[PDB]
Design a protein around this motif. Structure first.
Motif, PDB file in Angstrom:
ATOM      1  N   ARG A  82       0.828  -1.203   0.000  1.00 44.92           N
ATOM      2  CA  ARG A  82       0.000   0.000   0.000  1.00 44.92           C
ATOM      3  C   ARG A  82       0.863   1.254   0.000  1.00 44.92           C
ATOM      4  O   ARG A  82       0.584   2.214  -0.729  1.00 44.92           O
ATOM      5  CB  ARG A  82      -0.922   0.020   1.211  1.00 44.92           C
ATOM      6  N   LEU A 103       2.251   1.959  -3.545  1.00 43.29           N
ATOM      7  CA  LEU A 103       1.280   2.580  -4.437  1.00 43.29           C
ATOM      8  C   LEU A 103       1.096   4.053  -4.112  1.00 43.29           C
ATOM      9  O   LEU A 103       1.011   4.885  -5.021  1.00 43.29           O
ATOM     10  CB  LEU A 103      -0.069   1.855  -4.339  1.00 43.29           C
ATOM     11  N   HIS A 120       1.696   7.053  -6.768  1.00 42.71           N
ATOM     12  CA  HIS A 120       0.612   7.989  -7.039  1.00 42.71           C
ATOM     13  C   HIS A 120       1.069   9.439  -6.994  1.00 42.71           C
ATOM     14  O   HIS A 120       0.763  10.203  -7.914  1.00 42.71           O
ATOM     15  CB  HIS A 120      -0.530   7.783  -6.039  1.00 42.71           C
ATOM     16  N   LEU A 123      -4.434   5.980  -8.770  1.00 46.15           N
ATOM     17  CA  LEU A 123      -4.298   4.796  -7.932  1.00 46.15           C
ATOM     18  C   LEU A 123      -5.172   4.846  -6.687  1.00 46.15           C
ATOM     19  O   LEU A 123      -5.084   3.940  -5.849  1.00 46.15           O
ATOM     20  CB  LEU A 123      -2.831   4.623  -7.515  1.00 46.15           C
ATOM     21  N   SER A 136      -8.206   4.169  -6.006  1.00 45.19           N
ATOM     22  CA  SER A 136      -9.113   3.054  -5.753  1.00 45.19           C
ATOM     23  C   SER A 136      -8.397   1.850  -5.158  1.00 45.19           C
ATOM     24  O   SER A 136      -8.860   1.310  -4.145  1.00 45.19           O
ATOM     25  CB  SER A 136      -9.805   2.649  -7.039  1.00 45.19           C
ATOM     26  N   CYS A 137      -7.256   1.452  -5.741  1.00 42.55           N
ATOM     27  CA  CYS A 137      -6.495   0.309  -5.253  1.00 42.55           C
ATOM     28  C   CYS A 137      -5.805   0.605  -3.927  1.00 42.55           C
ATOM     29  O   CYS A 137      -5.603  -0.317  -3.129  1.00 42.55           O
ATOM     30  CB  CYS A 137      -5.443  -0.108  -6.281  1.00 42.55           C
ATOM     31  N   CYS A 179      -8.635   0.315  -1.302  1.00 44.26           N
ATOM     32  CA  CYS A 179      -9.001  -1.086  -1.114  1.00 44.26           C
ATOM     33  C   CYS A 179      -8.036  -1.795  -0.174  1.00 44.26           C
ATOM     34  O   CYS A 179      -8.461  -2.551   0.709  1.00 44.26           O
ATOM     35  CB  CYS A 179      -9.024  -1.820  -2.456  1.00 44.26           C
ATOM     36  N   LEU A 180      -6.732  -1.571  -0.344  1.00 41.26           N
ATOM     37  CA  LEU A 180      -5.776  -2.211   0.546  1.00 41.26           C
ATOM     38  C   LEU A 180      -5.939  -1.704   1.970  1.00 41.26           C
ATOM     39  O   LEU A 180      -5.874  -2.494   2.922  1.00 41.26           O
ATOM     40  CB  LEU A 180      -4.343  -1.956   0.062  1.00 41.26           C
ATOM     41  N   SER A 236     -13.809   0.920 -12.370  1.00 35.71           N
ATOM     42  CA  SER A 236     -13.451   0.184 -11.161  1.00 35.71           C
ATOM     43  C   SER A 236     -14.672  -0.221 -10.347  1.00 35.71           C
ATOM     44  O   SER A 236     -14.786  -1.394  -9.971  1.00 35.71           O
ATOM     45  CB  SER A 236     -12.525   1.022 -10.302  1.00 35.71           C
ATOM     46  N   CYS A 271     -16.283  -4.010  -9.774  1.00 34.55           N
ATOM     47  CA  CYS A 271     -16.471  -4.505  -8.412  1.00 34.55           C
ATOM     48  C   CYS A 271     -17.875  -5.061  -8.209  1.00 34.55           C
ATOM     49  O   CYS A 271     -18.045  -6.129  -7.606  1.00 34.55           O
ATOM     50  CB  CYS A 271     -16.221  -3.391  -7.396  1.00 34.55           C
TER      51      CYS A 271
END
Ligand code: CLR
Ligand code: CLR
Ligand code: CHT
Ligand code: CHT
Lengths: 333, 333
Positions: free
Chosen positions: A187, A190, A194, A200, A202-203, A206-207, B202, B206
């Motif tokens: 995390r 990323l 970014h 980035l 969204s990902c 999520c993490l 995204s 999902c």
């Protein structure tokens, strides 16, 4: 049912130690060349009033009245736990102290001129130390829960539980802190990428959500280990099933407990920080009050989570019969 | 253990009926003013050979040999199911037929000049009809599984199971198809907005993944209901726990069964479509072969999923003892 101490996990204890040795090798290789704690009891009466006034003025909410009653009852018992264990509230300062000592070692050794040991070390060891706090609190609370009378060790939080962690279950903590490390570091990578670009979000989010899910699960897994004295996977699977079967109760305890406990620390430090000014400007008192109120209610929340799982296990096993009596307090639901 | 028919869910049957009445009101208000089915048996020998040749030439994969052996054994039993129930393979055409009849009604009534009944109706009723197929297949397969000999109804798929769905468990299906409707529609709205702009990929992907997770769970929940004859929440929670405890087996069955079954339908329609051309150009034969091969292996996969859950329940309960015998075939693992 607690008289079984079987060490539970050894391979992950060896991997943790071997890593710590490798980190020490790299280190030496380059070198040699006014408190809010009043809430811990009284918040059990404030919470019940808060709910009582909020529901005055819609009525679809009544279907949850059974779930909130459990949340309130758990807070009442949590007050009893801190009354019986006066040392428990202060426990976060030894965790903080230990983290500082490691961090100073880490930053001092980074100055000597492989590098991956310091990046992984910083994160894994810090999570290890924090995970040790979670096992330590659960041990003390579980010991209280399963004691039917007032006979205990005078200073149980320092006379017990820590002895079990270091002697037997240290390997179980090692595995759990490793699993979360494998998420916390990607995390951070990323987030770095970014800011150097920027799509980035969204990902990364999520993490972040995954970290909270794993942490919560690990905290329950540690408590289940303290009671059943089994290995990590068995404890995590058993605790997971209970959290799913009672998911409605978990959602209520976490959503309502979070709202109430948030107001707890925020309202009391606002009152303390504005007291005694009398038109005299420093805000160092407000910051102090925030920091201590947070650490005091953070461990308060941990005690409530442990008591919930203890209740659930006390009903999955050890049902009522002439030869079987519950370990729970008068919380009937 | 199947002799208990208790209707299991009534409130959601009433809500489904009341909605259908409201949709009918709006309708009337505006008006009055060369087959691949051979695979259903022989694919059980092709699958075992396919694995046998793929693993020739790395060896880390051997830790999964126990999980693949289960996947293969389940395919063998699935062949027995279709041999015992000759009508089962043809069952998708009655589902298709019913969907067409509804769709023609829907589109014809949309032409008369509230609108939300037609948008929600189209989606909810179509999912209801499809969910009815899932209950229907599970009933027939469960009936076979728990029969210890060759005595059954001559045409069990039309003489049984559908009678239980319409008489007792229709409410259980109503709840499940409603839950997935609440996801399928928001996803369609996001897709519409995206094309009119374009950064929703995204959140759309999902929800799509969520739809597959809920569908799979619902299919297992329906089977659990057919066996235990309980309500939706109890069946879904029981099936969920089994899927988690055996998650390694579920992942293997779905990943390997999908790969093998994909080749099954693709390879056989390629062979059929190119046969008899003899340099003669139409491709209508290739399309026909695809469509029938897909519907035949789609229901094949459903039978395998039902057999897996039946196996798991047959080991959670009804263990071995002088007075207890398993309902399973000679699949020992
Ligand atoms: C293998 C050798 C070289 C190193 C072993 C280090 C051990 C003894 C250290 C590392 C982590 C430490 C724990 C980390 C955090 C806490 C919380 C605190 O409130 C009480 C002490 C307690 C529970 C520590 C006890 C000692 C501990 C277990
Ligand atoms: C309330 C009144 C007016 C209407 C009731 C309509 C009911 C009886 C209809 C609507 C949807 C239908 C189901 C839709 C699809 C299938 C799949 C097929 O392979 C077997 C029959 C089966 C399972 C149908 C049985 C009858 C059914 C449940
Ligand atoms: C922080 N809570 C424990 C309240 C929720 C975690 O999901
Ligand atoms: C389609 N499968 C059943 C193979 C997988 C669903 O997740």
């Amino acid at each position: 049912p607690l008289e079984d101490r079987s060490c539970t996990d050894i391979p992950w204890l060896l991997l943790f130690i071997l890593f710590c040795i490798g980190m020490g090798f790299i280190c030496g290789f380059s070198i040699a060349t006014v408190l809010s704690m009043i809430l811990m009891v009284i918040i059990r009466y404030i919470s019940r009033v808060l709910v009582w006034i909020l529901t005055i003025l819609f009525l679809i909410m009544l279907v949850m009245r059974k779930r909130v009653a459990l949340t309130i009852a758990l807070f009442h018992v949590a007050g009893k736990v801190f009354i019986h264990l006066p040392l428990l509230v202060f426990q976060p300062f030894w965790t903080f102290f230990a983290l500082v000592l490691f961090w100073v070692y880490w930053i001092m050794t980074l100055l000597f001129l492989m590098w991956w040991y310091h990046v992984v070390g910083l994160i894994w060891i810090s999570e290890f130390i924090l995970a040790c706090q979670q096992m330590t609190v659960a041990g003390a609370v579980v010991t209280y829960y399963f004691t039917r009378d007032k006979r205990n060790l005078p200073f149980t939080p320092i006379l017990a539980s820590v002895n079990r962690l270091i002697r037997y279950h240290l390997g179980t903590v090692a595995k759990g802190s490793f699993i979360i490390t494998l998420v916390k570091i990607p995390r951070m990578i990323l987030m770095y990428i970014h800011s150097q670009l920027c799509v980035l979000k969204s990902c990364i989010c999520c993490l972040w959500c995954l970290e909270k899910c794993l942490n919560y699960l690990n905290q329950n897994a540690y408590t289940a280990t303290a009671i059943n004295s089994t290995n990590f996977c068995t404890s995590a699977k058993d605790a997971f099933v209970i959290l799913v079967e009672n998911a409605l109760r978990v959602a209520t305890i976490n959503t309502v407990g979070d709202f109430m406990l948030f107001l707890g620390k925020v309202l009391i430090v606002c009152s303390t920080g504005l007291a005694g000014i009398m038109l005299l400007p420093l805000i160092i008192v407000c910051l102090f009050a925030f920091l201590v109120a947070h650490c005091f209610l953070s461990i308060y929340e941990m005690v409530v989570d442990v008591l919930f799982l203890c209740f659930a296990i006390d009903t999955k096993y050890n049902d009522g019969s002439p030869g079987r009596e519950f370990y729970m307090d008068k919380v009937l639901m």
